[PDB]
Every structure is written in C-alpha cells, then in structure tokens.
Amino acid sequence: VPVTGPGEESPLSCQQSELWFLNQRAHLGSSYDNVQMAYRVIGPLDRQAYARAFEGLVARHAVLRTSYLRRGDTYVQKVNDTTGFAVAFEDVTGDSAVTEFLRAERPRPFDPADRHMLRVHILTLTPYEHVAVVTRPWGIFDGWSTGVFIAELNALYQALSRGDEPSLPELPVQYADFAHWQRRTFDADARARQQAYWRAQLADLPSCTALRTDYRRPEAKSYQGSSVEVNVPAAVLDQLKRVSKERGGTLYMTLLSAFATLLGAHTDDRELAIGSPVTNRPRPELERLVGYFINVLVMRLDVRPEQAFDDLLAQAQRVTAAAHEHKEVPFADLVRDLVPEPDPAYSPLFQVMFNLVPAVEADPGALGFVPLPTDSGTAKFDLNLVVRETPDGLRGYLEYSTDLYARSTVRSMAATYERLLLKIVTQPGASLARLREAAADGGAG
Amino acid sequence: VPVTGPGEESPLSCQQSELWFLNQRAHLGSSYDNVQMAYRVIGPLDRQAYARAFEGLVARHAVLRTSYLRRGDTYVQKVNDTTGFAVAFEDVTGDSAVTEFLRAERPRPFDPADRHMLRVHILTLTPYEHVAVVTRPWGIFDGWSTGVFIAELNALYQALSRGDEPSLPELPVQYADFAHWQRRTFDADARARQQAYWRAQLADLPSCTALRTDYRRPEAKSYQGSSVEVNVPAAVLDQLKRVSKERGGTLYMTLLSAFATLLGAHTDDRELAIGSPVTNRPRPELERLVGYFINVLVMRLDVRPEQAFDDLLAQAQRVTAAAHEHKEVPFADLVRDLVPEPDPAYSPLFQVMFNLVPAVPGALGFVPLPTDSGTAKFDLNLVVRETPDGLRGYLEYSTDLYARSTVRSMAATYERLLLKIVTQPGASLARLREAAADGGAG
Amino acid sequence: VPVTGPGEESPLSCQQSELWFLNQRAHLGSSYDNVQMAYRVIGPLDRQAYARAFEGLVARHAVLRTSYLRRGDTYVQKVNDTTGFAVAFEDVTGDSAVTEFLRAERPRPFDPADRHMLRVHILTLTPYEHVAVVTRPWGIFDGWSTGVFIAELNALYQALSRGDEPSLPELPVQYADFAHWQRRTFDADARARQQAYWRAQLADLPSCTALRTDYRRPEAKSYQGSSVEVNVPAAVLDQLKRVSKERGGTLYMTLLSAFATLLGAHTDDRELAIGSPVTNRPRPELERLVGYFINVLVMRLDVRPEQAFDDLLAQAQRVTAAAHEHKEVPFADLVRDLVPEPDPAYSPLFQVMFNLVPAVALGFVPLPTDSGTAKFDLNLVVRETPDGLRGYLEYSTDLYARSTVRSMAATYERLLLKIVTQPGASLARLREAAAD
Amino acid sequence: VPVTGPGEESPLSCQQSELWFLNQRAHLGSSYDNVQMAYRVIGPLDRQAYARAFEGLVARHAVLRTSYLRRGDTYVQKVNDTTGFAVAFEDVTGDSAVTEFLRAERPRPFDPADRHMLRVHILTLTPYEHVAVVTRPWGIFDWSTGVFIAELNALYQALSRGDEPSLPELPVQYADFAHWQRRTFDADARARQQAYWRAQLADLPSCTALRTDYRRPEAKSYQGSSVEVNVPAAVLDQLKRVSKERGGTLYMTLLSAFATLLGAHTDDRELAIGSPVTNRPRPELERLVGYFINVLVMRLDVRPEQAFDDLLAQAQRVTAAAHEHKEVPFADLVRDLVPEPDPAYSPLFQVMFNLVPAGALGFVPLPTDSGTAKFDLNLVVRETPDGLRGYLEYSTDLYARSTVRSMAAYERLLLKIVTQPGASLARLREAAADG
C-alpha cells in the first residue's frame, strides 16, 4: 500500500545495496560499470514524439527521478519531479562516428544527488535512420525492468505519434512503498536466520577456485575481459526441456549442472562455488515496476567425476531450492561477514557465474529496430556464462577475464558446452567423465 | 500423360545436359562434385522402419532407379526396378569418427550404368543418436526435389513406424514423360530463336570480369574454395520487401542489384555478367516431382556509379524479364556456341553467381551437419535464402584468388549496403558504396 | 654533489608535483594514465641475459626503485635496494592474443609505497619471436629518460649476452641530490617572483576557448579521445628550419605559430592560450639521469587575422623567451592560485596543447599502443625525423568527429607549405590559400 | 657416360614406369599425388637473391626440365632449357591465410609436356617473416630433397655478399643414367627375374583377410589419415645392438616386429608387405637429382608357434633375395601377375613398410597432411638422434582413429623384444597387449 508522501525520505531496500557508489573501487573509477543501451531505428520517425515518450517514461517511473542523500553513515532515497530532464539531439555522419560517440558517452559520471538517473541521446543519420542511446548507472533497474521500459516506450510513442492520449495501466505502488513494506516484513530475526544459514552453507570452502589458466594470475585484478558466443539448436533445447521435466526439475537446473560438468574439466577440486542472480518480486503488484530486484546467490555443487549426471541434477535441485528459500539477505553482507580482508587478486566467495535470462515476450508503415553491439570490455569474474531462451533455441555468450585466458581456450570451452548439452540429451545414464570424454571430440579445436 | 512402358528408353531432357558425366574434367575426377547430405537424429529411432522408408521412397520416384546407357554419340535414360537397393548400417564411436567416415564416403564414384543413383547410410552412435547420410551424383535432382524428398521421407517413416500403411498423393507424371512432353512441345525453330537472342544479348562482353583479387590468377584452375556466412536482420528484410513492392519489382531483383552494386567496387568495368540458376516447372503437375529442373541464365547489368539505385532496379527488372522469357535453351549449348575454346583459367561467360534459394511427445529431432566440399566452380558465389528470422546464407569464394578477410569484409559490406539502400531512398551507387564503407576497420 | 645517505627521506622535486596520485580524478580511476611500451624483438634472443639486462637497468637508476611516503600534509621519497624486482614470462600465440594481453596488462594499479615503479613482461611467441613490455605510472620519467633507458638496456644486453662485463658511464649525481639542490636554490623569492609574473601575464584571459565543435560540450568531461596522423616531407621541414633560422628563431616557434594560425580559423577569439611541456635540466650532470624534468607553460598569443605571419612569429619569440625565463613554478600551483574552483567541463587555464619532441643482431619493431585518452580538447604532438616531420593530432571524442580532425591535419600540412612559399602574407590570406 | 645429345629422345628408366600419368584412375583425377614442401624464414632475407638461387638451382639440375612426349605406344624424354621458369611472389597476412593459400595451390594440375615440372612461391608476411613453397608432381625426384635444400642454401649464401657460386659438377645427368641402364640390360635376365618374382608370389591370397571396423566398399575411395609413432633413443640403440648381434639390421628387425604386430588382426598364415628401396648403383650417382625408388613386395611367415629369431632369419633371407632381384618395376609385376585389378583392393599387397634413411636465418618447416591413403596401412618411421619419429597412416574406409592409435601404441613391442628376444611371437603379442 502507498505509505510515502511527496518529498518524503525513504530507507533503501535490501537489493539497493549494490547501486554504484556503495561498491567503489579506487583504481577503476566510479563510472566504470555504467550500462549503455543503443539500437537503430528504421523508418519515418517523429523525433519530438519519441522524446516526449521518453519524458513520459521518466515522469511515470519514480526510480528514474530518485536521488540518494547521505544521512549519517547511511543513505536515503528521495523522489523528485520530472522537470529538468531532457533528450539530447546530435547529428552524426557515419557509423564509425556513432561508435566513437558511444565510446565517449558511456563513461560519463553519475552523482547520487542528481535529480535524474538517466541520459538519453537521439542521433540523426538520415530522416529514416536514427540511433537511440540510453545510459544509466549500475543498480538502478534490471533486465525485466528493461523489457517493461521498452514496451511502455513503444506504447507511449504509438499513442503520441498520432494525436491520441496515452492509455497505460495505473501503477499500484512505488519502489519506496516496496522498500517500506520490505523493512516492515522482518524483525532482523529472519536476517539472523538467513545469515546463519549462509554462514553454515559456505563453511570450509576454498577462498578461490583452482582453475587452470593460460596466464599467471596477477597480484591485482584488472577487470578487463571479452566474450565469445554460445548457440544451441532448438531441437536440443526441446529435448533438454523434456529431460528436465522427466526428472521433475527445471531448465535452469539442467543448464547449471552442465556448466558445472564443463568446469570440472579445468579444475581438480571436487566442489565448485558458482554465483547466480535471481529475481525477488514476491507480490503481484511488483511485476510491472521498474527497479532493482536482483540478488546474487552462491551455488555449491559436488562434481566428483564417478557420479551419474542424474545425481548431479538432484543435488542441483536441492541446492537451488534451499538458495531460493534463503534469498533475502544481500550478497554484500555475506561478503563482509565471511571475507573480512579481501584479496585483490580474485573476486570474493566465487569466481564463475551462470545466468539464465528470462525469455522475452505490426502496422504497415511501422518502424524497425536493430540493436547495436555494446561491449564494455569489462569482466568482474574469471568466467561468466549468460544464456537466454529464444524461439530459435538457446543464445548467449561466455565472458572471460583477459588477465587469465586466451580467446581460443574460451572458444573451445563454449564449443565443449554446446557439445555436452547434446551428449547429456543422447546418453541417458552416463557419468560426468563419460560425458566429458564424449563431448571432448572437438577435433583438438 | 504417361506414355512410357516397362523397359522403354527415353531421351534426355533439356535440364539433364549437366548430369555429372557430360561435364567430365580430367584433373578433378568423376566424383569431385558429389552431393552429400548428413543429418543427426535425436530420439528413439526405429532403424528398420526408417530404412524401409528409404526403400519406399526409392520405389516411389523413378529418377532414383534410372540408368543411362550410351547409344552412339548420345545417351538414353533407362528406368530400372527397385530390387537391389539396401541401406548400409555402421556403428561409430564419437563425432570425429563420423566426420572421417563422411569425408571418406563422399568421393566414392558413381557409375552411369548403376541401377540406383543413391547411397544411404545410417550410423548408430547410441540408441538415441543416429546420423543419416544421403549421397548422390550431381545433376540428379535439385533443392526443391530435396525438400519434397525430406517431407515424403518423414511422412513415410511416420506412417511406417506404427502398424499403419503408406498413403501419399499419386504421381501422375514420370520424369521420362516430362522429357517426352518437352521434346514434343519444342522444335529447332524455338531453339534457334532463343540462341539468336542469347547471342545478340551477350555480344561485345568481356570474356572475363576484371575483378581485382588478392592473388594472381593461375594459368589453370584448381576448383578449391570455402565460404563465409551472411546474416541480415528481419527488420531490414521487411523494409527491403516494402521497397521492392513499392517499385513494382521483387525481392530477387533488389538483392541482385545490391550484389551488382557491391561488385562494382572491386572492378572498373562498366558492364557485369552475373549467373543465376532459375527453376523451370511450367506445369502444375511438376511441383511434387523429384528431378532436375534448373537452368543458369546470364544477367547483364550496367553499373555506372553516377546513376540512382532506382535506375539499376528498373534495368534489372527488364533484364530479368527477358532472361525468364528466354530460359529454355541450356547453358551448355550457349557455352558451346559462344565460347568455342575456353580458357582453363576461368569459368565461361560469367565468373560470379547469385542465387536466391526459395524459402521453406515422441517426436524426433534433426540437426543438419556441416558438409563443406571445399569446391568453388566460380570466383564468387552468393547463396542466400529467406528465413522467418531474416536473410541467411553464405558467400563462397575461390581460394586461388582471395583471402578470408577480404570475403568477410565483402559480406559485411553487402549486409550494410542493404541497410543503406533501405535508409537512403534517393542515393546513387557511389554514395551507397561509400556510406556502407564506414565499417569501423571492417 | 651527493648530499643523501642510504635510507634517507628526500623532499619532492618541483617537477614531481604531478606524479600520478597527487592528481586523482574520482570517476576515472587511479591507473587511467599509465604509460605502456611494447616492442617486438626479431632474432635469436637470450631470454635470461635480456631479463638480467632489465634487472641491471633497474639497479642502475634509483628512480625506478623509489617509494613515496605520507608525512603529515606532504610526501617524501625513499630509495630502496634492487631486491624484489623480477621479469614476468608468458607464452603468447598470435597477434590478437598479444593485443588482448597488452590491453589487460596496462591498467593494473601502482601504489606509492611499492618498492619498484616498473613492470616488465617478456612474451615468447617462437624461439625467434618475442615481445617486450614495460609499464610505469605517470610522472616517473619523461621521453628523454626513455631514450636513455632503451640505449642503456641495449648496451647492457650486448655487453652481457656474450659473457662480458657491463661498461656504462658512472652516474655522478642522483635525483634526490637534484631535489635537494633545487630546494636550496628555489625557496621563496624566486617562487614569489615567478608567481607574480604568471599572475600578471595570464590576467584578463577567458576561462575556456570558444572553439566550434561538432557536438555540444557535456557538463562533465569524459577524457576519451583518439588521434589522426600528421606527416610532413623532409624538404618542407628543411625549408622551415631555414626560414626559422633567417629570423633568429627556432623550429618550435614556427610550428607553434602555424598551429595558432590553424586554430584561429575555428574560433572568433583574438587571444589563444596554448600549453607546452618544457624540459628543465639546468646542469651538465642531469643530461643522462632517468627522471621527470617536465613542466608545462602557457603561451598567450594574439591571433588578429590582419597581421602578417612575421609579426606572429616575433610575438611567439618574445612570449617563448619570457616563458622559458619563468619556467620553474609548477603548473599545479598556477592552477590552484588562478583557478580556485575549476569547472569539470574543460581543462584549467588552456584547452589546446602543442608538443614538439626532440629527435634522438636483433631487429626491433615497436607496437603502438593507442590509449584512447584525451586530457584536452586538441593535442598536437610532432616529432622531427630524418624523413621529415611525423606525429599525430589527438582530439577529444566528446566534441569532435574524425573527419573534422583529418581535415584539420590536412590543412595544417598544407599551411606549412604555404607559409614556406610566402611567409610575408597575412593570417587570413594564408588560411584562404590553405583552405583548398 | 654421355650417350645423349641435345634434342635427342631417350627411353624411360625402370623407376619411371608409373610416373604420375602412366597409372591413372578416372575417378580420383590426375593431380592428387602432388607433393608440397613449405618452409618459414625469420630475419632479414633478400628476396631477389633467394629467387635467383632457386632459378640457378633449377638450371643446375636436369630432371626439372624433362618433357614426356608420346611416340606411338610409348613415351620419350626431352631436356629443355631453364628459360621460362619463374618464382611467384605474393603478400600474405597470417598463418591461416598461408594454410588456405597452400591448400589452394597444391592440387593444380601438371601436364606431361611442360618445360619445368615444379612451382616455387615466396610469400612475404613482414620484412623478416617469409614463407617458401615448392611443389612438384609424383615421380620427379625422391636424398634428392636433401641435396636440393643443401644446394639451394649454398647458392643463396653464394649470391649473398657478392661472391661467386662454388658447387661440385654433376658427372652424370639422368639421361646418361637412363641410357646406361638401357644399355646394361637384356631381355633374358629380366625375364628370369620376372619368373622368379612370379614363382615367389604364387599361392598368395588375392587379398589379406584383415579385420576392419567397417565393411569394405565396392570401390576404394583412396582417403585416409595418419597417427604419429615415437621411439626413445636408448631402446633404439638396444635394437641396433641386437640387430648387429644376430647379423641383421635395424630395418630387418623393425619389419619383423611390424609383421608380428599385424599378425594379431589377421586370421591367415602368410603376409605380404611392400617396401620402397633406393636403387643407385655406380656410386658417383649419390649427388644426382632424380627418381630411384622402387617397391618390393616381401612375403613372410607369421605362424603363432615359431620363435622370433627364425622369423628374423626368414626376413633376412627374403630381403636378401629381394635386393638381389631389385630391378624389375612394380608396375610390370602388377601388369603380369594379376589379370584384372579389383577396384576395392590395392595391387598385390595392402600393407606397406618404409624406413626413411637419415648470421644464418631461422628455417622452420610447415608440414601438411595429404589426406590420402593408397593402402590399408602404411608405416613410415625415420631415424633421429632422439630415436624414431614417424607415423602410421590408414584407409579411412576401413578403420577408426582409435584402432590405429591402439595398433601404434608397435610401441612397447621393441621393449618386450629387447627384454626377451627369444620368446615366441604369439606370447610376445600376448605380453604386448598389456596396454
């Protein structure tokens, strides 16, 4: 229920512990982690209507106009009005100029006391070719909020290009109301229980996974990286869905088990710690809000090579069920409690991450949209597998740290993962080593 | 109408002038261009039912059991019986074994006197993983026949896996009947008119396009090559379809004009000759037959860089209309008439080819396997097809002339050129080329 | 003379006011300004001898093993022994792998308390193919020290691979000794005089030059940039040297005047403030040391288009003479004195820089590393070479597109020739002649 | 001895009976037996002097200028002049581009009536990194490659620094060798040798009954792959000591071990193995460039009840007889013995064994795999200071790579024949099966 009035300061939510200014790094910069979203617009575009649609989005979602003020040793959030926000217009001649403009625009700093947390650029190439650029600081809103943002932008533009009025559902609650409700629904006793659970679950775990890398690990992490693509056919994905439903699990569990099996070929450890971001939107009201609802959980898996893949599937099922049952405490609190002095050579509590992105859900003279490649060259962990489910199958990429790995090794790992999914499908009762050697027939590259 | 009897010897069709043995090359072999299809089957497969589906499919279509016997200076096609055809079964251990077996099985020779012109293999990896291999000599049947073949094989297996019986539409016309009809609905007069038209059209044309390559052309061609991928988003394809429809043309004309515009950057020639395979199925009772109905026509276009793209579109429309109305004479006849002595350094009458391929509980899964033969019959070969997710295909290049990076840059430039055509409705060819040149170091 | 003992904390030099940690930016990071050198080595290389040559070079120069410690409000420097330094070895397959490894290696942080200020990597491709990488933080040593570094490194390798003993001239003084001597010479009276002169010279100047840019200036500078190449043939360079000699000036003054003339076509202002780094080695003993001897001075030139090029040349001569006579006070002190509250949109006290750098078996092939950083709006760095003049024009990507900068470089190259042909014309006439 | 003059045609030598077009097969093409030889160069190289060294070496030799004209039902030779030969220069960027260029360049056809039977390419990557490629047809020259490289390098340093070339003069040209071989030849001793070869190869089965992973196709495809074989130096020294202790040689014991290894997969009593041998009499010909290789089929006995020493003695006897009857070409044996060759089978033997006899810039070879297999199995090993370094190639129509790797891992059999030389071959196989 709405419990916040105009100009009222509100406490920060649990998921808001990862914004951008609470996780600063001295040698990296405050704006190294900014998120940039660019795409190409094809067809006859009314620029003023598109800018007005962006302004309507800003005025509709209060997170985009929320400031963060320091009250003692902590922060509070304050909601402002939409006056002040504007869209920047530039004329660009060429696509290389577009790339240079994007590279120059991305790292511009954001300040917590800013009245708006968004930068929007519309670049005009021809009257039938435009580029829309949306840049935000880290921790403002997540991918589901990005899909909602895009859908509402399209709806507002279609309502505004022709002389109609917008017809959008009224938002039941704001993010400040959600923060107040979240602060109410715990007496710190639940926080104590979850902290105890996570302290017991990660006990006696190695501080760093002993992976085999191409290059020696430097004394200090550099946070540079790149990625290689991952592609899985639709028939294999359907067979994987059938396999997962036969065991009573989900597709995420099967893909996480496959990733663990793939990682088991590059390390001699019998247990792996893999981090995963999960969604926390436990109310029907919160499914259409724009905000940050993501927390990172550590999955601890036993990868002894003499066990069948079904045993690993059951273990992953149990581990993910428990992790989802204890997903309220922030990850930064776990890092602070379990890692007092962090080693600047590796990331805390886990070095590999697996992410399954939720699936994404026509006038004659309409507009076409083509996304543009935004590769920051940044890597927060040693390896990071991000995959999404598509009508044509499974798409994604494998991000890696350039301090440790060459491109060919990561390409080989991605190909091995793709082959291993098929091996899992076509060999019902194989073991981890049998599956690894069946998938290892990649012709030495 | 069916006019052939058991044991009747029928003359060859116009499209059967390029089978495999009427185009023999001494330094390549008789099986250098065998067509191999490999698929992976996922799920519980009944091997015997699937092989019996192959047997029934071979029995249904008579082209798969047709032999060719020499009669003096010509050849005649003789239909054999379905007896003697068996599917070979093998056990394999891993993917590398499958790849080695495929590259060992593809170049095995075919003989004109063979009773069946098909080789089928079923390789068993696990009870849930199978690889099916279908190999045929060139000139037997084309891609449309390949799609019909796959659909009928799936229907036959589905009807045969259970206790049911096959039930498929009847084939009113046999390919021998089509050959007889073609030879009776024809005369030396029509051939003379078409040959005269093609002699007049391809006059004062260079014997070889002066495309600037990476390496110098050898005195003899090796017929070795590779390919790179071509990808176009669906939105660009929709805008291209809108542009084509609003100009009175088709998508093929727009894509061919874009290919000509791209090729105009690598040469200083005013005219270009681009080959293109076209289908010839001029009867409603021929779209479900398995056979060869493909002929290659030469498209001649003016690519002066100071003209608008719409002028090129209109010229391409006119040229395509004329070529389609003069498409019955075989390309080999035109080569013989217009090119008496061919230079072994390059292909005759055209060196680049553009092809737009026509679009498009216990169930099994099918994953196509990559089969690159390493062959390149021309300097360049752009093969694209329409997909629900946009445009897909490849650009095949001769390795005697080009490096992989150059062809990659060419493919990226073509992909960007389609977008520049979409977004600039009045630019000239040079303007479009320089707008697409901004590729960011490639 | 040596006035320092082992384990003694010496005061910071005047040129050491801008090392890397006294000039931090919150949103950029502490290691955004690292300097990386990558070279390709061709031939049969003795790897251990070359690493030992690097170790001997480190042991030779005390700046490479100097730490900085916080004492109250300021910092002191302390020289350590050579123990601890080592060369890192990696096997790399391919050129793209080399580029990726370099990009990952460059931004690693340096700490003021580190015992050594250097990182050396030797990358082995094949027994006949190697890549040498040297990385240092900003403000450690300049380009002249880099030339001395490379020369002494190759001499050490040549005299060390064939089992001989190194033979290098002994270093008479040390950078700590130079800092002590500088403190004993420039205490408060010369400092007051120079501060007064620079306060009087730069008065009534606009905060930012009103340069016409392709894009609108953001409210906060991003410090991203790129560059385009500048090339001048040897004949034009020789004629420029001659015409500079005919009036008692040098080539630097002529090139700076040409740069000001070029920049006058993009602004309606009549006064230009151009920064230039100037070396300060006022002793015969300092000509061979490795260290930082660079200071930045601001040149104030009048660019009224009705004047002849000779008048601008004479004004540049006088301004350069005065600036060189007052080149001791650090630039950071001038910024803190004249700009108490800087604007994050533009750089303080000037936005355009001109920099003319002086001229200088295994084969060596350099690997240029474009950092993609711009500290000003425009930055011309030219080098005198036997085959003419070679360099680049670095520009901020917040304001300019590459085509405009390419046109600027072409116009500069044409303007040098037009200046050579008719040095007696006016600035507007020269711009119109070079506009073609 | 000079018995030939300019513009005069000489007949074909014995080792030229099946050169590359005299044993053609329609399905496989013509230019599939071409051999490619590539190398890498690091450091400052003078391209013009290197090309001039190549052209001078081609001028020095004589087999690189022979044309094979048709005269009725036979062929003749005709030595042309060095004019018309050149070196191709291309600019390449990257290793993958070099590999693709090599793959493109290799299979280009050769005609029996050209004037220079070789192609030379010099590819430039950087001012220091160069790639040199030499391609020639099948049967031109076989020692010949080593002397080719030696004279090429000598002429390169001769053309560098401005001094003059200094190489030994060739006493005999290949035309003189062919004339001498035809003069020192009568069709009575040759008939007796052919009769002996027919008698020795009698009673042999038409095909060996090897067990294969796949069914044999009705027509051979001539595709294949290979796997490497490695042998330590110490065990090679032990093998040489044992071979000289029993009066034999290293090749003899190696062939005996190969035969006893291949006896495991076969179910018959006798085996046939072919082996190439050099034929260079008149010892002034060891510096001559040409083709002198001929293959001899050796029939052995691999009974699982006899010992190994008697088998080694049998190998000694058969190799002595083969080297005593080492003039008749193999093509003559095929043309005479087997009436009609089955396309699924190699002629007269499916197994072959071969022992290969053994500041400046950095030369680095760039070997490539042919992908061809003329026989079911082909063992080739070359003696090196580290021991033996060779490979075993197989027909991909019959074998998977795992089986061939198992058969190679032949290894440990040298150890078990050094430890117990006098053991029976069957129990020797049983012991060697412990993998």
Listed residue (B375, B364, B311, B333) closest to B16, CA to CA: B333
Distance CA B154, CA B166 (A): 11
Out of D31, D223, D397, closest to residue B27 by CB: D31
CA distance to partner chain D, nearest, from residue B97 (Å): 6
Token pair for C38: 């990558």
Q: Which H/E stretch holds residue C380?
A: strand C378-385
Whether residue B27 and residue D29 make contact (CB cut-off 8 A), yes or no, is yes
**φ, ψ (nearest 5 deg) of residue D71:** -130, 90
- Does D touch A (3+ CB pairs < 8 Å)? no
Determine, for residues B28 and D26 on separate chains, whether the beta-carbon distance falls below 8 Å.
no
Residue B297, classified by CB atoms within 10 Å of its CB into exposed (0-12), middle (13-18) or buried (19+), is buried
Subunit contact C101:A215, Cβ cutoff 8 A: yes
Backbone phi, psi, residue D3, to 5°: -125, 10
**C-alpha to C-alpha distances, A39 to A93, A121, C203, nearest whole angstrom:** 16, 11, 48
**A441 with B366: Cβ contact below 8 A:** no
Q: What is the DSSP letter of A284?
A: G
Q: Which of B94, B366, B435 sits opposite A441 (nearest CB)?
A: B94
Q: Which pair of tokens denotes residue B306?
A: 């100071």
- B390 has a chain D CB within 8 A of its CB: no
Contact assessment for residue B347 and residue B377, using Cβ atoms and an 8 Å cutoff: yes
Q: What is the DSSP string of C166-215?
A: ---PPP---HHHHHHHHHHHSSSHHHHHHHHHHHHHTTT--SS-----SS
Contact between chain A and chain B (3 or more Cβ pairs less than 8 Å apart): yes
- Output the CA angle D258-D264-D268, nearest 5 degrees: 100
Interior/surface letters A79-100, b for 16+ CB within 10 angstroms, e for the rest: bbebeebebeebebebbbbbbb
A 10 A CB-CB count for C424 gives 8
Give the pairing of strands A368-371 and A393-401: unpaired
Nearest CA to CA, how far is C89 from chain D (Å)? 22
D396 in contact with B, Cβ within 8 Å = yes
Best residue in B416, B423, B434 to probe A by mutation, most A CBs within 10 Å? B423
End-to-end Cα spacing for chain B? 57
Contact C419, C430 (CB under 8 A): yes
C-alpha distances in Å from residue C321, one per residue of B217, C259, C315, C317, C358: 64, 18, 10, 6, 18
User: ∠ CA(D276), CA(D277), CA(D278), 5° rounding?
Assistant: 130
If DSSP codes are grouped into helix, strand and coil, which group holds residue C302?
A: strand
What CA–CA distance (Å, rounded) separates C383 from C376? 19
D363 reaches C (C-beta below 8 A): no
Most B CBs within 10 A among D87, D90, D100, D370, hence the mutation to make, goes to D100
Strand A119-126 and strand A88-91: the pairing is parallel
Tell me how far apart the alpha carbons of residues D10 and C431 are, in angstroms, rounded to a whole number: 81
Q: Give me the helices (H) in A264-353, please.
A: 309-325, 331-338
- Within 10 angstroms of residue C82's Cβ, the number of other Cβ atoms is 15
Provide the chain A residues 127-166 that lie in CB contact (below 8 A) with chain B: 128-129
The size of chain A, in residues, is: 445
Query: Could you give the CA distance from residue D173 to residue D64 in angstroms, rounded to a whole number?
Result: 12
CA–CA distance, D104 with B399 (Å, rounded to integer): 6
Method: cryo-EM
Helices B251-263 and B234-246, axial angle in degrees (round to 10): 110
Residue for token digits 């190294």?
A32
A340 secondary structure, DSSP code? S
Does residue A296 contact residue A276 with C-beta atoms inside 8 Å?
A: yes
Which value, in Å, is the radius of gyration of the alpha carbons in chain D?
Answer: 23
- Residue whose token pair is 């512990």: A17
What is the DSSP annotation of A375-444? ---B-SSSEEEEEEEETTEEEEEEEEETTT--HHHHHHHHHHHHHHHHHHHH-TT-BHHHHHHHHT-STT
SS3 B319: helix
**At what angle are helices B143-161 and B47-60 packed, to 10 degrees?**
130
DSSP B32: T
Q: CA of A224: which chain C residue's CA is closest? A: C104
Q: Which of C127, C361, C363 sits opposite D128 (nearest CB)?
A: C363
The tally of CA atoms less than 13 A away on the side-chain side of residue D325 is 22
The pair of structure tokens assigned to C205 is 């100047």
Interface mutation vs chain B, best among A126, A231, A241, most B CBs within 10 Å: A126
- Taking a C-beta distance cutoff of 8 angstroms, is the pair C21, C30 a contact? yes
Helix (H) / strand (E) element for B300: namely strand B294-302
Q: Beta strand C66-71 with C74-79: parallel, antiparallel or unpaired?
A: antiparallel
Q: How far apart are the C-alpha atoms of A107 and A92, rounded to whole Å?
A: 20
Rama region for D43: left / alpha / beta (φ>0; ψ in -120 to 50; rest):
left
A76 beta partners: A11, A69
A403 touches chain C (CB under 8 A): yes
A267, A272, A277, A278: CA torsion to nearest 10: 140
Structure tokens at B304: 């002066």
d(CA C175, CA C11): 10
Give D144's contacts (C-beta < 8 A, 6+ positions apart): D289, D290, D291
* Tokens linked to B146: 């390949």
Chain C, residues 73-112, CB within 8 A of chain D, namely none
For chain B, the residue count is 442
Q: D402 and B93 in contact by Cβ < 8 A?
A: yes
CA distance B352 to B397: 9
Q: How many whole angstroms separate alpha carbon C57 and alpha carbon B353?
A: 63
Interchain proximity C128–D362, CB inside 8 Å:
yes
Whether D290 contacts D174, CB under 8 Å: yes
| Resolution value, angstrom units | 2.5
CB-facing half-sphere around the CA of C416: CA atoms within 13 A: 27
Residues of A in contact with B419 (CB under 8 A): 42, 370
CA A224 to centroid of chain Cα atoms = 18
Q: How far is CA D312 from CA B361, D243, D263, D416, in A?
A: 65, 9, 15, 15
Handedness of CA D54, D58, D63, D68 (dihedral sign): positive
Which positions in chain D touch B107 (Cβ < 8 Å)?
Answer: 27-28, 221, 223
Q: Is C372 in contact with C398 (CB distance < 8 Å)?
A: no
Which residues 6+ apart lie within 8 Å of B73 measured at CB? none
Contact A95 B236 (CB under 8 A): no
Residue B339 vs residues B208, B327, B380, D305: alpha-carbon distances, Å: 12, 19, 21, 71
- Which residue type does A148 have? V
Q: In DSSP terms, which residues pair with D351 in a beta bridge?
A: D273, D377
Best of B232, B389, B418, B419 to substitute, by most chain A Cβ atoms within 10 angstroms, is B419
**CB within 8 Å: A368 and B239:** yes
| Element containing residue A49 per DSSP (H, E) | helix A47-60
B327 vs B296: CA distance, rounded Å? 8
Which chains border C (3 or more CB–CB pairs < 8 Å)? A, D
From residue B35, give the alpha-carbon distance in Å to each of A100, B109, B142: 47, 12, 10
Pull the structure tokens for residue C217: 């200036």
Rounded Cα distance, B280 and B282, in Å: 6
What stretch of H or E contains B320? helix B309-325
Considering only CA atoms, which of A251, A214, A227, A279 is closest in space to residue A384?
A: A227
Report residue A112: phi and psi, to 5°: -55, -35
Place of tokens 């939720």: A358
**CB-CB under 8 Å, D42 with C128:** yes
Write the CA distances from D75 to B179, D18, D118, D234, D328, integer angstroms.
46, 12, 20, 50, 18
Q: Using the Cα atoms of residue D411, residue D417, residue D420 and residue D424 in order, give the sign of their dihedral.
A: positive
Task: Confirm if D217 and D396 have CB atoms less than 8 A apart.
Answer: no
Is the separation of the CB atoms in B327 and B15 below 8 Å? no
Written as one letter, the residue type at B112 is: P
Chain D residue with the nearest C-alpha to that of C96:
D94
Q: Which residues contact A410 (CB under 8 A, 6 or more apart)?
A: A227, A228, A383, A398, A400
The Cβ-side half-sphere exposure at C148, using a 13 Å CA radius, reads 19
What is d(CA C198, CA B416) in angstroms, rounded to the nearest whole number?
A: 55
C275 backbone φψ class: left, alpha, beta (φ>0; ψ -120 to 50): beta
What letter does residue A281 receive in the DSSP assignment?
Answer: -
Subunit contact D28:B26, Cβ cutoff 8 A: no
Q: What is the 3-state secondary structure (H, E, C) of D187-224?
A: CCHHHHHHHHHHHHCCCCCCCCCECCCCCCCCCCCCEE
Chain C CB contacts of A135 under 8 Å are none
Q: Which domains does chain B have, with CATH numbers?
A: 9-178 (3.30.559.10), 216-359+361-436 (3.30.559.30)
The reply to whether residue D362 touches residue C42, judged by beta carbons under 8 angstroms, is no
Cα–Cα distance measured from residue C102 to residue A403, given in angstroms and rounded to the nearest whole number: 10
User: A100 and C226: CB-CB below 8 Å?
Assistant: yes
**D17 touches D331 (CB < 8 A):** yes
Picking from D26, D219, D402, the nearest residue to B108 by CB comes out as: D219
User: Which candidate, C329, C157, C313, places its Cα nearest to that of C248?
Assistant: C313
Sheet with B9-11, strands from edge to edge, namely: B9-11, B74-79, B66-71
**DSSP reduced 3-state for A11:** strand
Q: Which residue of C has its CA nearest to A88?
A: C216
Put simply, the chain D residues between 219 and 238 with a CB less than 8 A from any chain B CB are 219, 221, 223-225
Nearest C-alpha neighbor of B263 from the set B361, B161, B372, B397: B397
For chain C, the first-to-last Cα distance in angstroms comes to 58
Q: Quick one: closest CA in C to A119, which residue?
A: C218
For residue D138, give how far its alpha carbon lies from the nearest alpha carbon of chain C (Å): 33
Q: Name which of B354, B286, B362, B365 is nearest B319 in CA terms.
A: B354
Nearest Cα residue to B132 out of B154, B114, B115, B148: B154
- Whether A426 contacts B129, CB under 8 Å: yes
Give the Å distances, CA to CA, from B375 to B104, B222, B411, C35, D289.
16, 9, 19, 50, 35
CA angle B196, B199, B201 (to 5 degrees): 105
